[PDB]
């Protein structure tokens, strides 16, 4: 009974990256399959990842999640921000967050990020690298607040959309255990760094078509192929 898993619902996503986090600590429950894009380069029916990948996928854009996942280290006003390496969300939300703050974006590593804040620059990082700031609270300072990750297919796909809202109450109501499964399926995070941050990220899902819009506009400053992108809903 391999048709116990709807077919034609194959959702990928990056097992490393907080967008797959609620589908990975209840993935045992699931009526469909997952795949990790870390590790496989496929097609899939369902594709979950940053806004800012979505090109890559040519699928049409049905829900988005706010989660905040990064961090702001040192001064704002110094004229830097220090991020990870170009084509990361982290780069493309430092080099949004650069025409605010009048700063030049420095790809770098997470190390010298820390190192450079220190010293009186300021620097983006995932919250795995270091807590300062939430960047989500900046972007509401900003009336930026939208959300930076999306799933998209060829329709709405309400069974993906209500297990997702299952797996953030999981994580909700299980932080330990939400993290020790994370960090063995992620293969990237020790599970001290994920029990320490998996409450910060506060997964929420949208489906309001202006949100989806709103947030392909803003993240087409930095990745101009978006706006071809199609949102459904
Ligand atoms: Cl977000
Ligand atoms: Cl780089
Ligand atoms: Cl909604
Ligand atoms: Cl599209
Ligand atoms: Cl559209």
Redesign the pocket.
């Known amino acids: 009974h391999e048709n116990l898993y709807f077919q034609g619902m194959d959702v990928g996503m990056p097992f490393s990256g907080p967008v797959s986090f609620p589908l990975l600590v209840i993935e045992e429950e699931l009526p469909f399959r997952i795949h990790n894009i870390c590790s496989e380069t496929g097609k899939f029916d369902v594709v979950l990842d940053s806004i800012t990948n979505m090109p890559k996928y040519g699928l049409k854009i049905f829900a988005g999640?706010?989660?905040?996942?990064y961090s702001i280290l040192g001064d704002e006003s110094s004229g830097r921000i220090y991020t990870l390496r170009k084509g990361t969300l982290a780069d493309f939300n430092a080099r949004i967050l650069a025409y605010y703050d009048k700063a030049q974006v420095i790809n770098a590593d997470g190390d010298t990020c820390i190192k450079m804040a220190n010293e009186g620059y300021s620097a983006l990082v995932g919250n795995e690298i270091s807590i300062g700031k939430s960047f989500?609270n900046r972007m509401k300072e900003l009336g930026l607040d939208?959300?930076?990750?999306a799933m998209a297919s060829t329709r709405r796909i309400d069974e993906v959309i209500e297990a997702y809202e299952q797996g953030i109450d999981f994580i909700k109501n299980n932080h330990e255990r939400a993290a020790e499964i994370i960090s063995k399926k992620s293969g990237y995070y020790s599970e001290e760094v994920m029990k320490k941050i998996i409450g910060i990220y506060g997964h929420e899902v949208t489906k309001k078509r202006a949100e989806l819009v709103g947030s392909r506009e803003l993240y087409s400053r930095v990745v101009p192929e978006l706006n071809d992108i199609e949102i459904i809903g």
């Open positions: 999640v706010r989660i905040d996942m989500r939208l959300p930076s990750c």
